[PDB]
From Swiss-Prot:
Function, as annotated: ATPase component of the chromatin remodeling INO80 complex which is involved in transcriptional regulation, DNA replication and DNA repair. Binds DNA. As part of the INO80 complex, remodels chromatin by shifting nucleosomes. Regulates transcription upon recruitment by YY1 to YY1-activated genes, where it acts as an essential coactivator. Involved in UV-damage excision DNA repair. The contribution to DNA double-strand break repair appears to be largely indirect through transcriptional regulation. Involved in DNA replication.
Position of the signal peptide: none
Assembly with partners or alone: Component of the chromatin remodeling INO80 complex; three different complex modules assemble on different domains of INO80. Interacts with DDB1. Interacts with transcriptional repressor protein YY1; the interaction recruits the INO80 complex to YY1 target genes. Interacts with YY1AP1. Interacts with tubulin alpha. (Microbial infection) Interacts with Epstein Barr virus (EBV) lytic switch protein BZLF1; this interaction participates to the activation of early lytic viral genes by BZLF1.
Top-level taxonomic group: Eukaryota
Full protein stretch here: 565 to 613 of 1556
The protein's name in its UniProt record: Chromatin-remodeling ATPase INO80
Family: Belongs to the SNF2/RAD54 helicase family.
Domain notes for this protein: The DBINO region is involved in binding to DNA.
Tissue specificity: According to PubMed:10574462, widely expressed. According to PubMed:16298340, specifically expressed in brain, liver and pancreas.
Native organism taxonomy: Eukaryota, Metazoa, Chordata, Craniata, Vertebrata
Subcellular location field: Cytoplasm; Nucleus; Cytoplasm, Cytoskeleton, Spindle; Chromosome
General remark: Although the ATP-dependent helicase activity displayed by the INO80 complex requires INO80 ATPase activity, it is likely that the helicase function is carried out by the other components of the complex, RUVBL1 and RUVBL2, and not by INO80 itself.
DNA sequence: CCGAGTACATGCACAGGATGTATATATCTGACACGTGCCTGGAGACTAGGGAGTAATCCCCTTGGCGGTTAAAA
């Protein structure tokens, strides 16, 4: 389950806190949340698709 | 066997929050905007000459106005 994808459901206000705590926690793992508008959905679609 | 009541289910209303929307603002840039002198094609003034249509008659057709008949409108 390490190499597999993991979807974490967190609030929009705690997304930055989980991103900072995840970056300072495990820097070897990439943190790529999902937020924004249709443009950010196109960027996340180009990167994650 | 029937009525009272307690419990569970449910539905509606209100408030929070997220996302879509639209305008307010910022900024560097193509383009309006503004001199600077050129000049040559225009724009007008000034004599002289032409000419066609306005104006007044007046002769002459083509309108606008009378009474019936059936044919089309109702």
């Amino acid at each position: 389950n390490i190499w597999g994808p993991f979807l974490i459901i967190s609030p929009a206000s705690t997304l930055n806190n989980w991103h900072q705590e995840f970056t300072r926690f495990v820097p070897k793992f990439k943190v790529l949340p999902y937020w924004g508008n249709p443009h950010d959905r196109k960027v996340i679609r180009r990167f994650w698709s």
